[PDB]
Design a protein around this ligand. Structure first.
Ligand code: SAH
Ligand code: ZN
Ligand code: ZN
Length: 882
């Protein structure tokens, strides 16, 4: 019927070798060999395009069919060639790519092409079930080819139904793949769409003769039927006569490194930070330079210098756990967990989206309600406790062997360990020198080392997840924090007795019993809302209100704590490695005024405080104590203090906050829509629309707190315990991951025993975990000492890192030392210790009943015997499986 429908008819009639010769006849191709190679090796600094797609967009660009600018959206990004190419264009500023990925579909590639810092690619996205957004440049390369034009037509029509909603937000530039432009209905539709939205159809010469696909580009203008049919003629012409040679063009070289970005970064108080910036620069004057292409938006940039790379993207498998957990070799929830990428590119790709942010200052009335509540809470906590200076001797007894040294300057680089440095008088001379500076209104050495935390986390793009920032100062600068504010931790100011709502010093054992009490109290549902990246959300004003403890100190102590807060918390100098162009690595010197650093001595103690103030303010807003106008100006501040004195403690004792983790049991469910103050303080809730009311729990046993949910379980005799539970896959997955590279079988086997024993103490109620832990304990030599880290948690008290009998250690934590356990009758055998209900166990990732597990259980005795030979026969083992 149409010139293209004719071409498709002919193409379908083609034989295998007719088609073969035809497909590339007189087409254009980019020379992709050099790119394929580097990509196989993983050379992100090559400037190589991730796909052919990059040249398909450079072609339209040079002709004037597309002039990308501003906010660029890549719908069906795949590897992201259109995305990475977009980021090189002088007028584009942000580039967000979205793709399906996973099985059978292409996943975003992580290259360091010029401007990679303005690219955010996302997988597991089905654009047909994604709401439109306003953008400046709209790109969409979706269209799976088919043998039937009936299938290609319905495939194109669905794609244009999708972009219609996007295009009515009027993007300035657009490029949409039109797979089937040649059918009557498709010509009819495209004319109607060209009328309504503009642009036109262009055929790319880089395309094979096997597709009639054209791109609906913003810079084109031509009758759609003239455009479609001139290209149909081309394709028909290429069928008849001899085969023409293919034309080869050199591929696009994007380049390498980050792009220069628009700054909204607050001005540095150089009178405070200047001496440290100038000291760093003098110890690095040979390499020190100012990078024009630094990627810092909200941080002040002070300079960079050539420095060696640190960290790795490597994850290893704990063969021991892997062999004893065969039914999970399938489960992607477990097999998908691995080490995080702590390399300079690994951390910086998270930094740019999560840490390089600037939260708008809260309003004056909000700023005041915060101040009233914070003064009240500091006065309440200090009622029974006195601030005090913590000592050198207190610190020595507290400092571990595994504690970071963090040496930044020449004079601090004298020791190889923290344990060695504290036993050196030359160290304490440095501490004394800095305190002298602090007392002279100066800071010379309190600079933060920032890097990626090596954690076990689920992956992204079939690759290791990027790493979260961890920032601590050097040992000496940390002691000065300790001596001024360490009283908060050491004298347990955030403990549940002193704070009512805190949980400092409690283990996962006890945490469940708190939420059980909390449920008995009348009121609404329980609300466990996560603040999306709490530390980054800590404002100028939050730090101001925190510094209100300073009033309860003696003038000298206040002076010391004030110099720490003002020069180290209110103002910060951060040292970070960043990947540069040419495969080089630079160390950057940046600074900021808001936010919390993870490695501050009183980070948990302050996050806890500020979170209680936040929760208290939400209860006032909910109970209608705070009004709509009270954000701008606090009308009648007396109403705040009256509420606090009447209900302050009663509401506090209805909370459980551990740093950034919280659970509030309000008076009613008005708390769910009490978001005005919440959002004004920048405490924006995680994975919810900024104004959609919060979702609460009617069942306390379902409430998430500290990565867990807690269950009341009753013994054989009848007594009860409130145990910690989480999804089994998170547990087996993390157990199956090995940190340290180049490990002897002992190092792996001993970390497998640590996981097994932790499971025996906290997760004994999970049927699979008790079995697998007994299997691990049976396959690993008995006299081998458990090693490594099983949790980074403050509530994971490491009672399982012992050679002692686990049934003895279990009785000690659940009976003997359990303050919620009246009867001290010890449990004599493990068969008395119950399991979670079969519905609950199965709800949290259990495989009871599934035949691959059922088989696994039956032959565990033999698979243990196998792992015994793997670790070595000649070793002494014991059977914990009978
Ligand atoms: N419903 C959908 N939602 C999102 N992406 C989809 C999709 N259907 C297909 N895709 C993806 O769209 C991509 C089309 S190919 C895009 C190529 C890209 N412009 C480049 O330069 O590499 C494929 O990777 C496919 O998996
Ligand atoms: Zn200092
Ligand atoms: Zn559970």
């Amino acid at each position: 019927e149409t010139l293209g429908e004719k071409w498709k008819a002919r193409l379908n009639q083609m034989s295998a070798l007719e088609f073969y010769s035809y497909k590339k006849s007189g087409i254009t191709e980019v020379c992709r060999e050099e790119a394929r190679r580097a990509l196989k090796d993983g050379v992100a600094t090559g400037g190589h395009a991730v796909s052919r797609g990059s040249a398909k967009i450079r072609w339209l660009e040079e002709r004037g069919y597309l002039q990308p600018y501003g906010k660029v959206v890549d719908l069906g990004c795949g590897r992201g060639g259109w995305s990475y190419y977009a980021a090189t264009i002088r007028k584009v500023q942000e580039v967000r790519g979205y793709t399906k990925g996973g099985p059978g579909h292409e996943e975003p590639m992580l290259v360091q092409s010029y401007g990679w810092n303005i690219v955010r690619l996302k997988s597991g996205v089905d654009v047909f079930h994604m709401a439109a957004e306003p953008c400046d440049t709209l790109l969409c390369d979706i269209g799976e080819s088919s043998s039937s034009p009936e299938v290609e037509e319905t495939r194109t029509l669905r794609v244009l139904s999708m972009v219609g909603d996007w295009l009515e937000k009027r993007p300035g530039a657009f490029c949409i793949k039109v797979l089937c432009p040649y059918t009557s209905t498709m010509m009819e539709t495209m004319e109607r769409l060209q009328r309504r939205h503009g642009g036109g159809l262009v055929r790319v010469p880089l395309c094979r003769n096997s597709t009639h696909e054209m791109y609906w580009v913003s810079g084109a203008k031509s009758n759609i039927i003239k455009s479609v049919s001139t290209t149909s003629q081309l394709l028909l012409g290429r069928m008849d006569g001899p085969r023409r040679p293919v034309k080869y063009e050199e591929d696009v070289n994007l380049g390498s490194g980050t792009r220069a970005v628009a700054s909204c970064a607050e001005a540095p108080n150089m009178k405070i930070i200047g001496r440290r910036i100038e000291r760093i620069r003098n110890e690095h004057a040979e390499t020190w330079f100012l990078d024009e292409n630094h990627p810092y938006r909200t941080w002040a940039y002070h300079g960079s210098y050539e420095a060696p790379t640190q960290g790795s993207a490597s994850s290893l498998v704990n063969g021991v756990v892997r062999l004893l957990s065969k039914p999970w070799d399938v489960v992607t929830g477990v097999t998908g967990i691995a080490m995080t990428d702590t390399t300079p590119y690994g951390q910086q790709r998270v930094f740019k989206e999560k840490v390089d942010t600037r939260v708008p200052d809260p309003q004056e009335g909000t700023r005041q309600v915060m101040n009233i509540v914070s003064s009240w809470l500091w006065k309440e906590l200090g009622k029974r406790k006195r601030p005090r200076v913590c000592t050198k001797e207190e610190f020595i007894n507290k400092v571990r062997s595994n504690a970071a040294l963090g040496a930044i300057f020449e004079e601090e680089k004298e020791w190889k360990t923290a344990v060695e440095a504290v036993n050196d008088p030359r160290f304490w001379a440095l501490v004394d020198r800095e305190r002298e500076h602090h007392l002279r209104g100066e800071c010379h050495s309190c600079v933060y080392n920032m890097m990626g935390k090596r954690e076990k986390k689920q992956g992204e793009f079939g690759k290791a997840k990027g790493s979260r920032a961890i920032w601590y100062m050097w040992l000496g600068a940390r002691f000065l924090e300790f001596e001024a504010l360490g009283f908060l931790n050491e004298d347990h100011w955030m403990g549940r007795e002193n704070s009512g709502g805190g949980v400092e010093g409690l283990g996962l054992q006890r945490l469940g019993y708190i939420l059980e009490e909390m449920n008995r109290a009348p009121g609404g549902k329980m609300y466990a809302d996560d603040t999306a990246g709490w530390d980054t959300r800590i404002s100028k004003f939050d730090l101001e209100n925190e510094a209100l403890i300073t009033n309860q100190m003696e003038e000298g102590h206040r002076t010391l704590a004030l110099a720490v807060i003002k020069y180290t918390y209110q103002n910060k100098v951060v040292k970070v490695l960043r990947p540069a162009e040419g495969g080089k690595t630079v160390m950057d010197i940046i600074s900021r005024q808001d936010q919390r650093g993870s490695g501050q001595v009183v980070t948990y103690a302050l996050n806890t405080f500020t979170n209680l103030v936040v929760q208290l303010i939400r209860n006032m807003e909910a109970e209608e104590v705070l009004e709509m106008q009270d954000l701008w100006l606090l009308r009648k501040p007396e109403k705040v203090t009256r509420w606090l004195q009447s209900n302050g403690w009663d509401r506090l004792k209805r909370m459980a906050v551990s740093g950034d983790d919280c659970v509030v049991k309000p008076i009613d469910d008005r708390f769910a829509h009490a978001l005005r103050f919440l959002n004004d303080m920048g405490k924006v809730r995680k994975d919810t629309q900024e104004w959609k009311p919060s979702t609460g729990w009617s069942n306390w046993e379902e409430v998430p707190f500290c990565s867990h949910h807690f269950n009341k379980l009753y013994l054989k005799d009848g007594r009860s315990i409130v145990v910690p539970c989480r999804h089994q896959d998170e547990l087996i997955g993390r157990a199956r991951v090995s940190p340290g590279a180049g490990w002897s079988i002992r190092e792996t086997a001993c970390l497998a025993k640590s996981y097994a024993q932790m499971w025996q103490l906290l997760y004994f109620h999970r049927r699979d975990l008790r079995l697998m832990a007994n299997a691990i304990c049976s396959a690993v030599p008995v006299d081998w000492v458990p090693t490594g880290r099983t949790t980074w948690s403050i509530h994971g008290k490491g009672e399982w890192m012992t050679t002692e009998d686990m049934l003895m250690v279990w009785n000690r934590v659940w009976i003997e030392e359990n303050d919620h356990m009246e009867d001290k009758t010890p449990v004599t055998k493990w068969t008395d210790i119950p399991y979670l209900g079969k519905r609950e166990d199965l709800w949290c990732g259990s495989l009871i009943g599934h035949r691959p597990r059922t088989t696994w259980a039956e032959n565990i005795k033999d698979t243990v015997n196998m792992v015994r030979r793997i670790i070595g026969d000649e070793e002494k083992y014991m059977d914990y499986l009978s």
